[PDB]
Design a protein around this ligand. Sequence first.
Ligand code: CA
Ligand code: CA
Length: 323
Amino acid sequence: DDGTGQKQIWRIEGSNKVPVDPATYGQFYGGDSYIILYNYGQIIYNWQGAQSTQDEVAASAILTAQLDEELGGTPVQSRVVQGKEPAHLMSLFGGKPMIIYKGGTSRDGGQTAPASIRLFQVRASSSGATRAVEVMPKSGALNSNDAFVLKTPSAAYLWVGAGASEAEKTAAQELLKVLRSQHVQVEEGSEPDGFWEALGGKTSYRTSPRLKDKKMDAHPPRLFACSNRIGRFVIEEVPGELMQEDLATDDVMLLDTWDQVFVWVGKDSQEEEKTEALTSAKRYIETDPANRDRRTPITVVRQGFEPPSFVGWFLGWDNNYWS
Ligand SMILES: [Ca+2]
Ligand SMILES: [Ca+2]
C-alpha cells in the first residue's frame, strides 16, 4: 500500500527480540537480523543482514514464528535478505532511504562501535528505492555511478559521481542528517585534497564511461546466473540489487551492461559452463542488432581478478570476500 501504516521493529540479539529505537527505524545493522511488523491484514518481514551471524538468523526464525502465532497465524510471514528487499518494505520509511551500518551485535561480542572515518555508498533503484551501505573508507571504493558520504570526526564530504541520480543525491543528505554532520558537497573530479586524505589514498576507483552515463536507464545492467548442474545449461536472472554474494562461485555469471557484456568465471565453475556462457553472451548481443551495435565486446573476467569498471556495478565489494 504505502508503508505509511504503523509498524514495530525488533533486532534479534542472542535469542531475544529487543525493540529498535523508533527514530532510528530506517537504519539497520548488517551484522544482525531484524523482525518488523506491518499493518495494511498484517505482514511480518524477517530481514537478514548480509553479515548476520548464523545463530542470529536461526533464532530469528524461532521468534518470527511465535509472533505470527500470537496474532493467530493471520499475518503473512515474509523472509528477506539485505539488498533484495521488496518495493513495499522499502516504502515503510516514508521518503527516507535505508541506511545499512556495518557491524552490529552477537552472542559473546556485544554491540560494536562505529569508527570515526566512515564511508557510505548511496545507490538508488530504477523505481527510486535508495539504500546507503557502509563501506571501507578507501578511495578504491568510490564509484562514478553513485553518491557517497565520507564522514570524519570533524567534517564530512558529499561526493557525487557523474552517474549519480537525483534520488541518490538527496538520499545522501538524508544520511548526513542521521550522521549529524555539516557536509560539503563535492562533484566527482574537483575534490579537495582534504578529502583523499581521509580515504588515505591517491585515487583509482571504479569508473567507466558507462558508469557515468545518464541514459543507463534505457537498459540498466542485468546480471544472469548460468549453471549446468542439472545436465543442461540453464540461465537465470539475478533479482534485486546486484551483490557480490550473487556471483555463483560454482558457476558462471553474465553481466550485460549493454555497451559491453562481461562473463564472470566462478573459481569452481566447469569448463563447459564457461563455453556455453560465452555463446550465450553472443546470442544476447545478436538478439536485436538494429538497436545493438554488432561490435559489442564480450569480456571474460575471473573471480578475484575483476576490473573496477565491473565491480563498480555492485553495491558494496569486499576485496577479501572469497578469501
Ligand atoms: Ca547510480
Ligand atoms: Ca557449476
